Design an enzyme around this catalytic site. Structure first.
Site, short mmCIF file in Angstrom:
data_model
loop_
_atom_site.label_atom_id
_atom_site.label_comp_id
_atom_site.label_asym_id
_atom_site.label_seq_id
_atom_site.Cartn_x
_atom_site.Cartn_y
_atom_site.Cartn_z
N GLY A 13 48.60 37.13 42.76
CA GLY A 13 50.14 37.79 42.51
C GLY A 13 50.95 37.95 43.78
N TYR A 15 52.19 38.77 46.54
CA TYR A 15 51.82 38.63 48.16
C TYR A 15 50.54 37.89 48.39
CZ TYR A 15 55.98 41.58 48.65
OH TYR A 15 57.42 42.04 48.74
N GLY A 16 49.48 38.18 47.39
CA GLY A 16 48.21 37.65 47.84
C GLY A 16 47.14 37.67 46.82
N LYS A 33 42.68 42.28 50.42
CA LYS A 33 43.95 41.63 50.30
C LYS A 33 44.43 40.76 51.35
CE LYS A 33 48.23 42.63 47.87
NZ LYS A 33 47.79 41.75 47.00
N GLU A 73 40.13 50.50 48.93
CA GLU A 73 38.87 51.04 48.26
C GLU A 73 38.84 50.42 47.19
OE1 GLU A 73 38.97 54.86 46.37
OE2 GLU A 73 41.25 55.05 46.76
N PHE A 74 37.75 50.12 46.41
CA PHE A 74 37.44 49.40 45.05
C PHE A 74 37.30 50.19 44.13
CE2 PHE A 74 34.76 47.24 42.28
CZ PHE A 74 35.23 46.00 41.99
N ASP A 119 56.87 47.31 41.17
CA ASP A 119 56.26 46.34 40.25
C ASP A 119 55.22 47.07 39.40
OD1 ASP A 119 55.83 43.81 38.99
OD2 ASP A 119 54.25 43.45 40.38
N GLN A 123 48.04 45.85 34.97
CA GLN A 123 47.34 45.25 35.75
C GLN A 123 46.89 45.70 37.39
OE1 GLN A 123 48.42 42.47 33.45
NE2 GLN A 123 49.98 43.97 33.60
O1 LIG Z 1 40.17 47.99 43.12
C1 LIG Z 1 40.19 47.16 42.48
N1 LIG Z 1 39.78 46.57 41.46
C2 LIG Z 1 39.99 45.74 40.48
C3 LIG Z 1 38.75 45.16 39.45
C4 LIG Z 1 39.38 44.36 38.62
C5 LIG Z 1 40.57 43.93 38.23
C6 LIG Z 1 41.51 44.65 39.51
N2 LIG Z 1 41.18 45.26 40.44
N3 LIG Z 1 41.67 46.38 42.69
C7 LIG Z 1 42.64 46.57 43.77
C8 LIG Z 1 42.38 47.32 44.81
C9 LIG Z 1 43.45 47.39 45.71
C10 LIG Z 1 44.73 46.61 45.65
C11 LIG Z 1 44.57 45.63 44.74
C12 LIG Z 1 43.57 45.57 43.84
C13 LIG Z 1 43.88 44.51 42.96
C14 LIG Z 1 44.65 44.85 41.62
C15 LIG Z 1 45.60 43.61 41.08
C16 LIG Z 1 46.21 43.32 42.69
N4 LIG Z 1 45.33 43.98 43.55
C17 LIG Z 1 45.68 44.64 44.54
O2 LIG Z 1 46.49 44.46 45.26
#
Ligand SMILES: O=C(Nc1ccccn1)Nc1cccc2c1[C@H]1CCCN1C2=O
Length: 276
Positions: A13, A15-16, A33, A73-74, A119, A123
């Protein structure tokens, strides 16, 4: 980068592409990212210090070899997958109401810092097993669905209010399990909003007819009853929703005010029912 083992692609999406990755040093998993400018570099640093329980934390910024990697962070699930997995029964109202209240706290934190998301959508809204929801994919600013009308009409100087509209649309989506304005082009998007909320005018929106893309030839539509639009939201919610969906950016409710709306007198923090 030469420090991260990329486990899998989780997003893309504008940016990247984003990845689930583990830092070979620490061992910790994170979201990498891969972006794609002095100005961009400087802005990004602003975000490094922007910290709040509901904003997805930006861990590190790696501008190396003339490339940009953002380490966050995830979190395991986005709201979109969670809404999909709940299509049959819908999300419980206390869960919805908890998520809207946390999303509002974050948006209220960003706004008082003059930072906009721009935005917002299901998602980039992330959730964890502890009942917390977080704002992701911002500070950086393909669907038109949650785009505010002022942006569709050519306004260049957006207000924090564009976010409140997006959130408003998301709120209506969680409740009805159906997307409010699923338009498939800038103009189809605009005509769907006009069909539900009625074609705006100088009375409901002073200044609208002097907007860039406004055309006197826009078909005239009547506003529909919010009761037909968002059943079964009670009066308190439908109330809050209509204040978030006001055509005039200036009359639209702020995140701080929405925080005190009577619809959150009974908020709680239930834990979701997620499967990873
Ligand atoms: O932590 C994340 N987990 C996750 C797992 C499944 C689907 C989407 N995200 N995602 C996460 C964390 C930080 C930045 C971003 C994201 C993903 C979501 C859409 C675009 N992304 C980003 O720019």
């Amino acid at each position: 980068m030469e420090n991260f083992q990329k486990v899998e692609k989780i997003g893309e999406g504008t940016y990247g592409v984003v990845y689930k990755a583990r830092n070979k040093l620490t061992g910790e998993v994170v979201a990498l990212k891969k972006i794609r400018p002095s100005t961009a570099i400087r802005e990004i640093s602003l975000l490094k210090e922007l910290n709040h329980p509901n904003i997805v934390k930006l861990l590190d910024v790696i501008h190396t070899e003339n490339k940009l990697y953002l380490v966050f962070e995830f979190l395991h699930q986005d709201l979109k997958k969670f809404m999909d997995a709940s299509a049959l029964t819908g999300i419980p109202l206390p869960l919805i109401k908890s998520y809207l209240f946390q999303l509002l706290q974050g948006l209220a934190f960003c706004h008082s810092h003059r930072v906009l998301h721009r935005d917002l959508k299901p998602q980039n809204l992330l959730i964890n097993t502890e009942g917390a929801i977080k704002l992701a994919d911002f500070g950086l600013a393909v669907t038109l669905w949650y785009r505010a009308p002022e942006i569709l009409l050519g306004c260049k100087y957006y207000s924090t209010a564009v976010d409140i509209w997006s959130l408003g649309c998301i709120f209506a989506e969680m409740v009805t399990r159906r997307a409010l304005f699923p338009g498939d082009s800038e103009i189809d998007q605009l005509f769907r909003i006009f069909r539900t909320l009625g074609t705006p005018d100088e009375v409901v929106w002073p200044g609208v007819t002097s907007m860039p893309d406004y055309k006197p030839s826009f078909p005239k539509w009547a506003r529909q009853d919010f009761s037909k639009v968002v059943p079964p939201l009670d009066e308190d919610g439908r109330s809050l929703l209509s204040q978030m969906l006001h055509y005039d950016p200036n009359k639209r409710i702020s995140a701080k005010a929405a925080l005190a709306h009577p619809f959150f007198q009974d908020v709680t923090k239930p834990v979701p029912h997620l499967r990873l």
